[PDB]
Design a protein around this ligand. Structure first.
Ligand SMILES: Cc1cc(-c2n[nH]c(CCNC(=O)c3cc(-c4ccc(F)cc4)cc(O)c3O)n2)ccn1
Ligand SMILES: [Cl-]
Ligand SMILES: [Cl-]
Ligand SMILES: [Mg+2]
Length: 213
């Protein structure tokens, strides 16, 4: 089997159904002790939690679910009725994410879409009845952070105050995105320095709040 299947199995055998916190803990244990994986992790995850609590978004889009760690992290803090849409390009990982969310008891809050961000973003309004997004978590291909931000804007999915939160802006790094949002009058940016998941390597999150045209 694959690493991702092993992570799911470990959660199923070491966490409590319906207990998101136990799911996060199980994933972090496995990835610290057994096999590294590209989940956002606990260090950056704590920063994400603080942001989600500050903004209490009603509708969140995640780009790049992987195994569902971040989707569990965000969805467990959403208010009743609030929703997460998450996109995952790898079909095997999309299925793992669905199963992860099901185990965590968060499946009614989250819709996991299998496909590429460039294809799915233009369908959000008419197919998924999205008006505007309250928050976007960028965690997909690092080359796509900038084009997909621009595409979100083109599609009319951003409003004044939409929060973009970007993983991995240092490692692997997203230099074009960072330069762009930090240089743009349409964004108010803050950097949260942290560490790459499960590693003693500096990484960070960027928050970029959309200001309108
Ligand atoms: C809908 C759609 C979805 C996607 C999509 N789905 N899933 C992803 C995952 C992307 N993530 C990464 O590659 C990533 C890599 C590292 C890393 C690797 C190796 C190192 F040595 C150091 C760090 C660390 C991380 O935290 C990462 O997030 N993209 C893509 C396109 N369209
Ligand atoms: Cl993750
Ligand atoms: Cl960590
Ligand atoms: Mg990441």
């Amino acid at each position: 089997d694959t690493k991702e299947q092993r992570i799911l199995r470990y959660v199923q055998q070491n966490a409590k159904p319906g207990d998101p916190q136990s799911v996060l803990e199980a994933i972090d244990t496995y990835c610290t002790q057994k096999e590294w994986a590209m989940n956002v992790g606990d260090a950056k995850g704590q920063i994400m939690d603080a942001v989600i609590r500050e903004y209490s978004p009603s509708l969140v889009l995640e780009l790049g679910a992987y195994c569902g760690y971040s989707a569990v992290r965000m969805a467990r803090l959403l208010q009743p009725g609030a929703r997460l849409l998450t996109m995952e390009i790898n079909p095997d990982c999309a299925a793992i994410t669905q199963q992860m969310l099901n185990f965590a008891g968060l499946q009614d809050k989250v819709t996991i879409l299998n496909g590429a961000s460039q294809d799915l973003i233009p369908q959000l309004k008419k197919k998924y009845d999205v008006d505007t997004l309250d928050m976007v978590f960028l965690d997909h291909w690092k080359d796509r952070y900038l084009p997909d931000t621009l595409l979100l804007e083109k599609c009319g999915l951003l409003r004044k105050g939409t929060v973009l939160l970007a993983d991995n802006v240092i490692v692997p790094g997203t230099p074009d995105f960072l330069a762009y949002v930090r240089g743009s009058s349409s964004f108010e940016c803050t950097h949260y320095s942290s560490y790459l998941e499960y590693m003693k390597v500096v990484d960070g999150l960027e928050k970029a709040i959309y200001q309108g045209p």
